[PDB]
């Protein structure tokens, strides 16, 4: 009973759930000093991590504002002057920086703050829109999207825009790297929802698969492509799902490409 | 006792000691899975904190490159076209972002140098060198440095280069903005070390004192604040009795 409590609390903290376990302050006899020192440890760790994460959020917010004024200026150029070759350079770079700042803001919105404004939502209600937009996007690319099993009215608790973006990034990423087909499969049990996204694109090496959720990920074969953001997408996915008490895995797809697995616990 | 082992291990990690794997895997069969999962937690936390630091150390590098291509585009427009009003606007914002990125680059060079394994260090051993270099720098500026009370062999846990640079930045800043004198005073109790840096320079308004640790206003005191806060301490900016700015750093003591 007390060893089980401390093991589950250490395994929880190890996944990114830096929250107080009052359960360790009810421990019979002597595991109260160990449990109370453990919760003191959690508080100290949370205070230590939020400092660097805050610096990140502050830089993100300070960078955001002049870039918007810059984006306004370029829009006013396109007004006085026409379609120039230089504008095609400036607006391109402006958008690249824009996406980067926005993604930095998001990664400072997720893991950093406990200030998460959460609500109770149902899986189908949450991701149906994302799946429909992904289906349209697939149709436009001349690619096929098959939802092996759709999400049902399964209870979840957390930030809806965060989870919406978490699945949106996974499926859009699968849309990008795929050759012709993409597959999305939902699955539920007593404990939680498991979303599996497969693509028939080029496989990812077992070394790269382990470090794909890295903030700025040096991808071999996709650096040569240069057809995306900066690699913040998947790190956003990971931080967003981990703060939602879930997990993310990257495996080799039976379609031949990359398999992405998301797991989220059910609300009770 | 196994509860005492786990309590001392949790109290160690709480002080920033991830850089140690205690032997919680040698005793009763039940406390072995808890001990092994605890050490796995320590490794995961260490892996989580070095990744957060890597992110800040990479932002500068990632943002720099497209901004330079943007600055190239605008430069080519001043070449093919004249000096438009909109180009003046875009270039103003481009220079604002430019300076910010350059300062972030400076922050990732200082993080790349000071980036190490947090370890157990003694206050005097840590900052004596910084205080001596600051004394020489004061002498060269025709200014005076008085260490009211020196640091003693007081136990601390953390990155030595980080704390070295934190005090170095505070004292160098106080040397810059002072008129003639700077005072550094150390103080210890059972809980922690309190460093106070004063200068006879121009005072800082109570509004500005609250937003002095803001990132952009060549790293800034924001690094000082975040580095001391990650070292479980705190930083305060008050009005100095010398007439200038008083900077207070507090750091907790390490206990085995
Ligand atoms: N001792 C001081 N006396 C007066 N002004 C100070 C002092 N310390 C800091 N400041 C003010 O605080 C501002 C922010 O500090 P800082 O981040 O170190 O800026 P900087 O990049 O110029 O070194 C400085 O621009 C300066 O005007």
The vertex-B99 CA angle with B94 and B105, nearest 5°, equals: 120
Q: DSSP class of residue B215?
A: S
Nearest CA to ligand 1 atom 19: B220
**Domain CATH number, residue A172:** 3.30.565.10
Cβ within 8 Å of B, A 2-41:
2-4, 6-7, 10-11, 13-16, 30-31, 33-34, 37-38, 40-41
Residues B144 and B128 placed together within one structural domain of the fold: yes
β-bridge partners, A182: A145, A199
Say what the alpha-carbon torsion angle B164, B169, B174, B175 is, to the nearest 10 degrees. 90
CB–CB contacts below 8 A, A to B = 189
- Distance (Å, rounded) from C-alpha A214 to C-alpha B55? 9
Domain boundary among B115, B147, B169: B115
Helix (H, G, I), strand (E, B) or coil at A67: helix
Residue of A179, A171, A79, A176 whose CA lies nearest to A133: A171
User: CA-based diameter of chain B, in Å?
Assistant: 81
DSSP per residue, A190-242: SSEEEEEEEESS----HHHHHTSSSSS---TTTTTT--SS-SHHHHHHHHHHH
Under a CB-based contact definition with an 8 Å cutoff, are residues A20 and A43 in contact? yes
Residues B104 and B138 placed together within one structural domain of the fold: no
- Distance (Å, rounded) from C-alpha A177 to C-alpha A258? 9
Residues A144 and A259 placed together within one structural domain of the fold: yes
Cα–Cα distance list, A198 to A5, A192, A201, A214, B10 (Å): 37, 20, 9, 20, 41
β-bridge partners, B145: B182
Residues B106 and B2 placed together within one structural domain of the fold: yes
Residues A45 and A65 placed together within one structural domain of the fold: yes
Residues A124 and A248 placed together within one structural domain of the fold: yes
- Distance (Å, rounded) from C-alpha B182 to C-alpha B245? 10
Asked if B102 has any chain A CB less than 8 Å from its own CB, the reply is no
Q: How many CB atoms lie within 10 A of CB A80?
A: 11
Q: Which residues contact A68 (CB under 8 A, 6 or more apart)?
A: none
Residues A95 and A159 placed together within one structural domain of the fold: no
Cβ within 8 Å of B, A 78-97:
79-81, 84, 86-87, 89-90, 93-94, 96-97
Residue of A215, A230, A137, A210 whose CA lies nearest to A176: A137
- Only one residue has tokens 């980036």, namely B115
Asked if A65 has any chain B CB less than 8 Å from its own CB, the reply is no
Under a CB-based contact definition with an 8 Å cutoff, are residues B231 and B16 in contact? yes
Domain boundary among B74, B90, B115: B115
B221 C-alpha to ligand 1 centroid (Å): 8
Q: What is the least distance, in Å, from the CA of A44 to any CA of chain B?
A: 6
Cβ within 8 Å of A, B 104-163:
104
> Where do the DSSP E strands lie in B73-189?
119-122, 144-149, 155-158, 181-185
CB contact under 8 A, A215 and B48: no
Tell me the residue range of the domain where B95 lies.
1-115
Nearest CA to ligand 1 atom 21: B220
User: What totals of helices (H) and strands (E) does chain A contain, helices first?
Assistant: 7, 7
Residues B123 and B244 placed together within one structural domain of the fold: yes
The pair of structure tokens assigned to A141 is 């690319």
> Where do the DSSP E strands lie in chain A?
119-122, 144-149, 155-158, 181-185, 192-199, 247-252, 258-265
Q: Cβ contacts (< 8 Å) between A216 and chain B: which residues?
A: 55, 58, 61-62
> Considering its fold, how many domains does chain B have in total?
2
Domain boundary among A100, A115, A130: A115
Helix (H, G, I), strand (E, B) or coil at A115: coil
| Number of residues written out for chain B | 256
> Where do the DSSP E strands lie in chain B?
119-122, 144-149, 155-158, 181-185, 192-199, 234-239, 245-252
Residues B4 and B95 placed together within one structural domain of the fold: yes
Q: Measured from the CA of B219, which atom of ligand 1 is nearest?
A: 21
Instruction: For residue B70, give the nearest of A53, A58, A93 by CB distance.
Output: A93
Q: Which residues contact B180 (CB under 8 A, 6 or more apart)?
A: B143, B144, B200
Residues A249 and A186 placed together within one structural domain of the fold: yes
Residues A241 and A192 placed together within one structural domain of the fold: yes
**Domain CATH number, residue A29:** 1.10.287.130
β-bridge partners, A199: A182
Residues B68 and B138 placed together within one structural domain of the fold: no
Asked if A263 has any chain B CB less than 8 Å from its own CB, the reply is no
Under a CB-based contact definition with an 8 Å cutoff, are residues B58 and A216 in contact? yes
A166 C-alpha to ligand 1 centroid (Å): 41
Catalytic residues of B: 61
> Where do the DSSP E strands lie in B110-180?
119-122, 144-149, 155-158
Q: Measured from the CA of B208, which atom of ligand 1 is nearest?
A: 12
Nearest CA to ligand 1 atom 12: B212
Q: Cβ contacts (< 8 Å) between A93 and chain B: which residues?
A: 66-67, 69-70, 73
CB contact under 8 A, B229 and A59: no
Nearest CA to ligand 1 atom 26: B177
- Distance (Å, rounded) from C-alpha A209 to C-alpha A72? 39
B31, B86, B219, B235, best to mutate vs chain A, most A CBs in 10 Å: B86
Nearest CA to ligand 1 atom 22: B220
Inter-axis angle of helices B85-114 and A31-80, nearest 10: 150
Closest-approach residue (CA) in chain A for B96: A66
């Amino acid at each position: 009973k007390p060893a089980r409590k401390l093991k589950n609390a250490a395994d929880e903290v190890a996944q990114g759930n830096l929250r107080q376990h009052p359960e360790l302050e009810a421990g019979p006899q002597e595991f109260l000093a160990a449990g109370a020192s453990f919760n003191q440890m959690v508080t100290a760790l949370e205070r230590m991590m939020t400092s660097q994460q805050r610096l990140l959020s502050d830089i993100s917010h300070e960078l955001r504002t002049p870039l918007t004024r810059l984006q306004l200026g370029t829009a006013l150029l396109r007004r006085r002057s026409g379609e120039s070759k230089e504008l095609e350079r400036i607006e391109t770079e402006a958008q690249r920086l824009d996406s980067m700042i926005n993604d930095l803001l998001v990664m400072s919105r997720n893991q950093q703050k406990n200030a998460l404004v959460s609500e109770t939502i149902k899986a189908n209600q949450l991701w149906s829109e994302v799946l429909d937009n992904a289906a349209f996007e697939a149709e436009q690319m001349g690619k096929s999207l098959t939802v092996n099993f759709p999400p049902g009215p399964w209870p979840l608790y957390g930030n809806p825009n965060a989870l919406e973006s978490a699945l949106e990034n996974i499926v859009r990423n699968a849309l990008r790297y795929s050759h012709t087909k993409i597959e999305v499969g939902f699955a539920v049990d007593k404990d939680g929802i498991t979303i599996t996204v497969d693509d028939d694109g080029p496989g990812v090496s077992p070394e790269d698969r382990e470090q794909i959720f890295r903030p700025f990920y040096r991808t071999d074969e996709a650096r040569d492509r240069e057809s995306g953001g900066t690699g913040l997408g998947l790190a956003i996915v990971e931080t967003a799902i981990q703060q939602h008490r879930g997990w993310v895995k990257a495996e080799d797809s039976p379609l031949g490409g990359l398999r992405l697995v998301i797991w989220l616990p059910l609300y009770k």
